[PDB]
């Protein structure tokens, strides 16, 4: 299909993910350890921009450290090495003293009542309301007159303090050095005339009727309902109290430490950005704690019950319902089923969660040594969520488990060779799942280093890529009839000794393969076609590797030697190391070129006899098909299907 | 753009003050109550009319309308209400300012102009979602409606 | 992508979302009230998987409503009564399905096409006997893979 670049174009061990949205939105995102290179399935490099930097994707082992999750709306990128950190710079009311400020509600006055306000051990203001004999004594019972009369006495007694008269209240503010330590008011009318208002209230009904703009009050609770202490702020222009974030509270995490996204822009190019995670909007550090991933590393990203989920350590961190980037409750005063869920897997052994596998009407959380089913009794809430250990099977964490039909395939590494297991539901039992070793008869076949598990449901195979033997694609061919494995075929595909396979994904029986020889990186496609040629005008479907359709250009033929010599890097845009080369002409003439001793790079010429200028030819590398029979011994079966020799 | 001023009544010796846009547009001191006729000056409608005419003189191009137990003050197209406070000296029982936001349904003004729109914030006592109510003058009820804009 | 009916509601399939209307009011996709939460309120939730899943068909099958994508099949259920909170989208199987031909249900079975490079495989979607909630698809064109183009 295309040549992506040189040998090091994608790095030593790239992490490659297929993005398959629609018929026209098919791409590879290649994480090379230093950047992202995006190719469409035709092989054209798209541009990846880094508005917020590329430090999140810079790692020595992209396969071990980077996970990619693509859904219809977003493509999340999580770095398993980066530890999520909270933004200590973003603090709501960074230095707030609750005792710094106070209020004095003045609801009115009554005759013969001594208005007293007491601050810091002193009676800073004392006013005796007139007995009411004179007609004008009713002017002295006005709340605003009483508020102003006390305020001027407070200003004289408290020289450097700030005393302001509001609508039915007195706003007294201590200077920066000082603060309110004792704050009591005496009216002699059961607190009906004046009462002291601090920044704490017993309940919402006890809030002052009027307050300065932005006045912050913590609601303790009436001890009548299961209550969580919350904060309210007064809006002067709106004349309402709204729940807000507490004072001296950090609200944000560092977005550079959080999972990122890869977004296609309008120009067809991609942007690697952070995500705008919603901050804390209510409560404090105690009532609204940091999510469990804070201070830890997120291992996986998933979706469950219209929520975004994270896997960090032993915890499952689900976001608010329908709000993926918000991991905090909407309200602290009230509990909602939409509130984010933060629970830890509860076992007696170490269980770090690496993968979230949707399997058989359930969500399965996979650890290295155990598998858990994430359930809820009824509707999924913070209280209802349950993590139940269903099985204890060893699972390799480089390769995400791959689901085909009713089965999930995963790798379990051994000392020298990787065992591939099929995760399935046991037929009789209602809630028992099991893993079956599908490599039991070939335990020493797939070397350790499995980093990709893939396959096709339509073609009924599972393909395994291991870095122990990079030249091979291990193929598991299976057939299922009436809940029975009728075919279990294990084999491998090889494309050359120095060739390495970095990725191979199937899209409806078309297998698009990224290959790498010792000089170049290639994109190529394997198609399971019945009676269809691959290239236009080909005499037949030729079985060659790196198959290409080439029109021989002018100037290639040399009449001094009577040969038409074509240049392989001109044909492919790339060099080659070894392998027999076959040139197929439309009439059916085949010329085979053996490897030069130094290799194709040293002598990258194919000398075709005669003048072939202007003719279309078909060049490829011979596929070495091997099948060794088992020894022709007598085979017998028992009453069952078990065989014997 | 618009605001309301409920006038539930008056008390003797209480200074009724309404403050708009940094100015005390209307100020009225209720009589001390010595004379028998002072009980005529504590009537809510009389207080509403007295405050309205002072507001009309102070706010020239504004629209001030007296309703049933309330004062409907409307800013012109260019201007708007930026500061809106009323001082009565009786713990807001006589007059209180009414914006287009209310804490709860029980806090809605008893009477409003037809089609008056109020956003209900919530009392932070139940899991609450802010909603809108519109007043039906001919029906004298508040009905949940679609929000403005 | 699709129009369907479930629990006396009109349903839509758009992207990876299921948009169910208000109960018994097919053309209303908005709540009657914001002040109060009702079980009749419309349901709008996305299918929650780690892979791209565009919903194309809604197949009523075996006392359940099946939501079919190109690569996965989901069972639309609810824990108790179907509300906004109780709605669940659970991946039951991962089978490739052609989106041109709507799956056809005959008796206990649902038949659908899965295209290959050159010829189409027809599969029968069915319920497995022993397990309570495992569904399966069986290729009924296994012996004739190259028959239906």
GROMACS .gro file of N, CA, C and O in nm, chain A residues 423-503:
model
  324
  423UNK      N    1  -1.136  -1.661   2.731
  423UNK     CA    2  -1.228  -1.635   2.841
  423UNK      C    3  -1.371  -1.650   2.792
  423UNK      O    4  -1.410  -1.591   2.691
  424UNK      N    5  -1.450  -1.728   2.866
  424UNK     CA    6  -1.584  -1.763   2.822
  424UNK      C    7  -1.672  -1.787   2.944
  424UNK      O    8  -1.623  -1.798   3.057
  425UNK      N    9  -1.802  -1.796   2.919
  425UNK     CA   10  -1.898  -1.825   3.024
  425UNK      C   11  -1.929  -1.975   3.024
  425UNK      O   12  -1.959  -2.032   2.919
  426UNK      N   13  -1.921  -2.037   3.142
  426UNK     CA   14  -1.954  -2.178   3.153
  426UNK      C   15  -2.102  -2.199   3.123
  426UNK      O   16  -2.188  -2.120   3.165
  427UNK      N   17  -2.132  -2.306   3.050
  427UNK     CA   18  -2.265  -2.322   2.993
  427UNK      C   19  -2.371  -2.347   3.101
  427UNK      O   20  -2.475  -2.280   3.104
  428UNK      N   21  -2.347  -2.443   3.190
  428UNK     CA   22  -2.451  -2.480   3.286
  428UNK      C   23  -2.474  -2.371   3.390
  428UNK      O   24  -2.588  -2.333   3.417
  429UNK      N   25  -2.367  -2.318   3.449
  429UNK     CA   26  -2.380  -2.232   3.566
  429UNK      C   27  -2.431  -2.095   3.524
  429UNK      O   28  -2.404  -2.047   3.413
  430UNK      N   29  -2.506  -2.031   3.613
  430UNK     CA   30  -2.562  -1.900   3.583
  430UNK      C   31  -2.455  -1.792   3.579
  430UNK      O   32  -2.457  -1.705   3.491
  431UNK      N   33  -2.361  -1.794   3.673
  431UNK     CA   34  -2.265  -1.685   3.689
  431UNK      C   35  -2.122  -1.733   3.709
  431UNK      O   36  -2.048  -1.673   3.788
  432UNK      N   37  -2.080  -1.838   3.640
  432UNK     CA   38  -1.942  -1.884   3.645
  432UNK      C   39  -1.878  -1.866   3.508
  432UNK      O   40  -1.928  -1.918   3.408
  433UNK      N   41  -1.769  -1.790   3.504
  433UNK     CA   42  -1.688  -1.773   3.384
  433UNK      C   43  -1.562  -1.857   3.398
  433UNK      O   44  -1.524  -1.895   3.508
  434UNK      N   45  -1.499  -1.886   3.285
  434UNK     CA   46  -1.383  -1.973   3.283
  434UNK      C   47  -1.287  -1.928   3.174
  434UNK      O   48  -1.325  -1.859   3.079
  435UNK      N   49  -1.161  -1.967   3.189
  435UNK     CA   50  -1.059  -1.946   3.088
  435UNK      C   51  -1.007  -2.082   3.042
  435UNK      O   52  -0.978  -2.169   3.125
  436UNK      N   53  -0.998  -2.100   2.911
  436UNK     CA   54  -0.949  -2.224   2.852
  436UNK      C   55  -0.822  -2.196   2.774
  436UNK      O   56  -0.818  -2.106   2.691
  437UNK      N   57  -0.717  -2.274   2.802
  437UNK     CA   58  -0.592  -2.261   2.730
  437UNK      C   59  -0.608  -2.316   2.589
  437UNK      O   60  -0.616  -2.438   2.570
  438UNK      N   61  -0.613  -2.227   2.490
  438UNK     CA   62  -0.622  -2.268   2.350
  438UNK      C   63  -0.486  -2.297   2.290
  438UNK      O   64  -0.479  -2.339   2.174
  439UNK      N   65  -0.378  -2.276   2.365
  439UNK     CA   66  -0.244  -2.313   2.323
  439UNK      C   67  -0.188  -2.429   2.404
  439UNK      O   68  -0.067  -2.443   2.417
  440UNK      N   69  -0.276  -2.513   2.460
  440UNK     CA   70  -0.231  -2.625   2.542
  440UNK      C   71  -0.150  -2.726   2.462
  440UNK      O   72  -0.053  -2.782   2.513
  441UNK      N   73  -0.189  -2.751   2.337
  441UNK     CA   74  -0.116  -2.843   2.251
  441UNK      C   75   0.003  -2.778   2.183
  441UNK      O   76   0.083  -2.849   2.121
  442UNK      N   77   0.017  -2.646   2.192
  442UNK     CA   78   0.134  -2.575   2.142
  442UNK      C   79   0.187  -2.482   2.250
  442UNK      O   80   0.193  -2.359   2.230
  443UNK      N   81   0.230  -2.534   2.365
  443UNK     CA   82   0.272  -2.445   2.475
  443UNK      C   83   0.400  -2.370   2.447
  443UNK      O   84   0.421  -2.263   2.506
  444UNK      N   85   0.487  -2.421   2.360
  444UNK     CA   86   0.616  -2.360   2.331
  444UNK      C   87   0.619  -2.301   2.190
  444UNK      O   88   0.720  -2.311   2.120
  445UNK      N   89   0.509  -2.240   2.149
  445UNK     CA   90   0.493  -2.188   2.014
  445UNK      C   91   0.509  -2.037   2.006
  445UNK      O   92   0.590  -1.988   1.928
  446UNK      N   93   0.434  -1.963   2.086
  446UNK     CA   94   0.434  -1.817   2.083
  446UNK      C   95   0.533  -1.767   2.188
  446UNK      O   96   0.508  -1.787   2.308
  447UNK      N   97   0.643  -1.704   2.149
  447UNK     CA   98   0.740  -1.657   2.248
  447UNK      C   99   0.684  -1.545   2.334
  447UNK      O  100   0.592  -1.473   2.295
  448UNK      N  101   0.741  -1.532   2.453
  448UNK     CA  102   0.701  -1.426   2.544
  448UNK      C  103   0.727  -1.290   2.481
  448UNK      O  104   0.828  -1.269   2.414
  449UNK      N  105   0.635  -1.197   2.504
  449UNK     CA  106   0.645  -1.066   2.444
  449UNK      C  107   0.525  -1.031   2.361
  449UNK      O  108   0.533  -0.948   2.269
  450UNK      N  109   0.411  -1.093   2.391
  450UNK     CA  110   0.288  -1.065   2.318
  450UNK      C  111   0.241  -0.925   2.353
  450UNK      O  112   0.215  -0.893   2.469
  451UNK      N  113   0.230  -0.839   2.250
  451UNK     CA  114   0.186  -0.702   2.268
  451UNK      C  115   0.059  -0.668   2.193
  451UNK      O  116   0.001  -0.561   2.217
  452UNK      N  117   0.014  -0.754   2.101
  452UNK     CA  118  -0.109  -0.730   2.027
  452UNK      C  119  -0.185  -0.861   2.013
  452UNK      O  120  -0.128  -0.963   1.972
  453UNK      N  121  -0.313  -0.858   2.048
  453UNK     CA  122  -0.406  -0.967   2.020
  453UNK      C  123  -0.518  -0.909   1.935
  453UNK      O  124  -0.582  -0.810   1.973
  454UNK      N  125  -0.541  -0.970   1.819
  454UNK     CA  126  -0.638  -0.919   1.723
  454UNK      C  127  -0.701  -1.038   1.652
  454UNK      O  128  -0.679  -1.154   1.689
  455UNK      N  129  -0.779  -1.010   1.550
  455UNK     CA  130  -0.845  -1.114   1.474
  455UNK      C  131  -0.970  -1.060   1.406
  455UNK      O  132  -1.003  -0.942   1.417
  456UNK      N  133  -1.038  -1.149   1.336
  456UNK     CA  134  -1.157  -1.115   1.260
  456UNK      C  135  -1.271  -1.207   1.298
  456UNK      O  136  -1.255  -1.330   1.298
  457UNK      N  137  -1.386  -1.149   1.332
  457UNK     CA  138  -1.505  -1.229   1.352
  457UNK      C  139  -1.557  -1.291   1.224
  457UNK      O  140  -1.603  -1.405   1.223
  458UNK      N  141  -1.550  -1.216   1.113
  458UNK     CA  142  -1.598  -1.268   0.986
  458UNK      C  143  -1.513  -1.384   0.937
  458UNK      O  144  -1.565  -1.483   0.885
  459UNK      N  145  -1.381  -1.374   0.952
  459UNK     CA  146  -1.291  -1.478   0.906
  459UNK      C  147  -1.262  -1.583   1.013
  459UNK      O  148  -1.197  -1.683   0.983
  460UNK      N  149  -1.309  -1.561   1.136
  460UNK     CA  150  -1.302  -1.661   1.243
  460UNK      C  151  -1.158  -1.698   1.277
  460UNK      O  152  -1.120  -1.815   1.276
  461UNK      N  153  -1.077  -1.597   1.308
  461UNK     CA  154  -0.941  -1.621   1.352
  461UNK      C  155  -0.902  -1.518   1.457
  461UNK      O  156  -0.960  -1.409   1.465
  462UNK      N  157  -0.803  -1.555   1.538
  462UNK     CA  158  -0.740  -1.465   1.633
  462UNK      C  159  -0.591  -1.462   1.604
  462UNK      O  160  -0.527  -1.566   1.593
  463UNK      N  161  -0.537  -1.341   1.590
  463UNK     CA  162  -0.397  -1.323   1.555
  463UNK      C  163  -0.321  -1.260   1.672
  463UNK      O  164  -0.371  -1.167   1.737
  464UNK      N  165  -0.202  -1.312   1.699
  464UNK     CA  166  -0.120  -1.271   1.811
  464UNK      C  167   0.013  -1.220   1.757
  464UNK      O  168   0.077  -1.287   1.675
  465UNK      N  169   0.054  -1.102   1.803
  465UNK     CA  170   0.184  -1.044   1.769
  465UNK      C  171   0.272  -1.045   1.893
  465UNK      O  172   0.235  -0.987   1.995
  466UNK      N  173   0.388  -1.109   1.882
  466UNK     CA  174   0.484  -1.117   1.991
  466UNK      C  175   0.617  -1.058   1.946
  466UNK      O  176   0.661  -1.080   1.834
  467UNK      N  177   0.680  -0.982   2.036
  467UNK     CA  178   0.812  -0.928   2.006
  467UNK      C  179   0.923  -1.029   2.029
  467UNK      O  180   1.039  -1.000   1.997
  468UNK      N  181   0.892  -1.146   2.085
  468UNK     CA  182   0.991  -1.252   2.092
  468UNK      C  183   1.031  -1.302   1.954
  468UNK      O  184   1.148  -1.332   1.929
  469UNK      N  185   0.934  -1.311   1.863
  469UNK     CA  186   0.959  -1.346   1.723
  469UNK      C  187   0.885  -1.245   1.636
  469UNK      O  188   0.775  -1.273   1.587
  470UNK      N  189   0.942  -1.126   1.616
  470UNK     CA  190   0.868  -1.019   1.547
  470UNK      C  191   0.832  -1.051   1.403
  470UNK      O  192   0.739  -0.989   1.349
  471UNK      N  193   0.901  -1.145   1.339
  471UNK     CA  194   0.875  -1.173   1.199
  471UNK      C  195   0.747  -1.252   1.178
  471UNK      O  196   0.697  -1.258   1.065
  472UNK      N  197   0.692  -1.312   1.283
  472UNK     CA  198   0.577  -1.400   1.270
  472UNK      C  199   0.449  -1.333   1.318
  472UNK      O  200   0.450  -1.258   1.416
  473UNK      N  201   0.340  -1.360   1.247
  473UNK     CA  202   0.205  -1.334   1.295
  473UNK      C  203   0.143  -1.469   1.327
  473UNK      O  204   0.118  -1.550   1.237
  474UNK      N  205   0.118  -1.495   1.455
  474UNK     CA  206   0.062  -1.622   1.498
  474UNK      C  207  -0.089  -1.621   1.479
  474UNK      O  208  -0.157  -1.530   1.528
  475UNK      N  209  -0.140  -1.721   1.409
  475UNK     CA  210  -0.280  -1.725   1.368
  475UNK      C  211  -0.351  -1.839   1.439
  475UNK      O  212  -0.308  -1.954   1.432
  476UNK      N  213  -0.461  -1.807   1.507
  476UNK     CA  214  -0.548  -1.906   1.568
  476UNK      C  215  -0.678  -1.912   1.488
  476UNK      O  216  -0.763  -1.823   1.500
  477UNK      N  217  -0.693  -2.016   1.407
  477UNK     CA  218  -0.812  -2.036   1.327
  477UNK      C  219  -0.908  -2.128   1.402
  477UNK      O  220  -0.869  -2.236   1.446
  478UNK      N  221  -1.032  -2.083   1.417
  478UNK     CA  222  -1.131  -2.158   1.494
  478UNK      C  223  -1.264  -2.157   1.421
  478UNK      O  224  -1.293  -2.068   1.341
  479UNK      N  225  -1.345  -2.259   1.449
  479UNK     CA  226  -1.483  -2.266   1.403
  479UNK      C  227  -1.571  -2.310   1.519
  479UNK      O  228  -1.530  -2.395   1.599
  480UNK      N  229  -1.690  -2.252   1.529
  480UNK     CA  230  -1.785  -2.284   1.634
  480UNK      C  231  -1.915  -2.332   1.572
  480UNK      O  232  -1.981  -2.257   1.499
  481UNK      N  233  -1.952  -2.456   1.600
  481UNK     CA  234  -2.080  -2.512   1.559
  481UNK      C  235  -2.151  -2.566   1.682
  481UNK      O  236  -2.098  -2.655   1.750
  482UNK      N  237  -2.270  -2.514   1.709
  482UNK     CA  238  -2.353  -2.561   1.820
  482UNK      C  239  -2.276  -2.560   1.952
  482UNK      O  240  -2.275  -2.659   2.025
  483UNK      N  241  -2.210  -2.448   1.981
  483UNK     CA  242  -2.134  -2.430   2.105
  483UNK      C  243  -2.019  -2.529   2.117
  483UNK      O  244  -1.984  -2.572   2.227
  484UNK      N  245  -1.958  -2.566   2.005
  484UNK     CA  246  -1.848  -2.661   2.004
  484UNK      C  247  -1.735  -2.608   1.917
  484UNK      O  248  -1.760  -2.564   1.804
  485UNK      N  249  -1.613  -2.614   1.968
  485UNK     CA  250  -1.497  -2.586   1.885
  485UNK      C  251  -1.476  -2.699   1.786
  485UNK      O  252  -1.424  -2.805   1.821
  486UNK      N  253  -1.517  -2.676   1.661
  486UNK     CA  254  -1.497  -2.773   1.555
  486UNK      C  255  -1.363  -2.758   1.485
  486UNK      O  256  -1.318  -2.853   1.420
  487UNK      N  257  -1.298  -2.643   1.497
  487UNK     CA  258  -1.166  -2.620   1.440
  487UNK      C  259  -1.080  -2.549   1.543
  487UNK      O  260  -1.124  -2.453   1.606
  488UNK      N  261  -0.958  -2.599   1.562
  488UNK     CA  262  -0.857  -2.534   1.645
  488UNK      C  263  -0.725  -2.541   1.570
  488UNK      O  264  -0.652  -2.640   1.583
  489UNK      N  265  -0.696  -2.438   1.492
  489UNK     CA  266  -0.578  -2.437   1.407
  489UNK      C  267  -0.483  -2.329   1.455
  489UNK      O  268  -0.517  -2.211   1.456
  490UNK      N  269  -0.363  -2.370   1.495
  490UNK     CA  270  -0.257  -2.278   1.534
  490UNK      C  271  -0.147  -2.283   1.430
  490UNK      O  272  -0.096  -2.391   1.397
  491UNK      N  273  -0.111  -2.167   1.377
  491UNK     CA  274  -0.004  -2.156   1.279
  491UNK      C  275   0.047  -2.013   1.283
  491UNK      O  276  -0.001  -1.930   1.361
  492UNK      N  277   0.147  -1.984   1.201
  492UNK     CA  278   0.202  -1.850   1.194
  492UNK      C  279   0.224  -1.812   1.049
  492UNK      O  280   0.237  -1.897   0.961
  493UNK      N  281   0.225  -1.681   1.025
  493UNK     CA  282   0.258  -1.623   0.896
  493UNK      C  283   0.393  -1.554   0.907
  493UNK      O  284   0.423  -1.492   1.009
  494UNK      N  285   0.474  -1.567   0.803
  494UNK     CA  286   0.606  -1.507   0.801
  494UNK      C  287   0.622  -1.426   0.673
  494UNK      O  288   0.575  -1.467   0.566
  495UNK      N  289   0.686  -1.310   0.685
  495UNK     CA  290   0.703  -1.219   0.573
  495UNK      C  291   0.849  -1.190   0.542
  495UNK      O  292   0.877  -1.102   0.459
  496UNK      N  293   0.942  -1.260   0.604
  496UNK     CA  294   1.084  -1.236   0.587
  496UNK      C  295   1.153  -1.241   0.722
  496UNK      O  296   1.094  -1.214   0.827
  497UNK      N  297   1.281  -1.278   0.719
  497UNK     CA  298   1.355  -1.298   0.843
  497UNK      C  299   1.385  -1.166   0.912
  497UNK      O  300   1.372  -1.154   1.035
  498UNK      N  301   1.426  -1.065   0.835
  498UNK     CA  302   1.456  -0.933   0.890
  498UNK      C  303   1.333  -0.844   0.897
  498UNK      O  304   1.342  -0.732   0.948
  499UNK      N  305   1.219  -0.891   0.849
  499UNK     CA  306   1.096  -0.814   0.853
  499UNK      C  307   1.032  -0.830   0.990
  499UNK      O  308   1.030  -0.940   1.047
  500UNK      N  309   0.980  -0.720   1.044
  500UNK     CA  310   0.911  -0.722   1.172
  500UNK      C  311   0.771  -0.667   1.153
  500UNK      O  312   0.752  -0.567   1.083
  501UNK      N  313   0.673  -0.731   1.216
  501UNK     CA  314   0.534  -0.689   1.209
  501UNK      C  315   0.504  -0.607   1.333
  501UNK      O  316   0.514  -0.657   1.446
  502UNK      N  317   0.466  -0.481   1.314
  502UNK     CA  318   0.435  -0.391   1.424
  502UNK      C  319   0.287  -0.386   1.456
  502UNK      O  320   0.249  -0.375   1.573
  503UNK      N  321   0.200  -0.394   1.355
  503UNK     CA  322   0.057  -0.394   1.378
  503UNK      C  323  -0.013  -0.463   1.262
  503UNK      O  324   0.036  -0.462   1.149
   0.00000   0.00000   0.00000
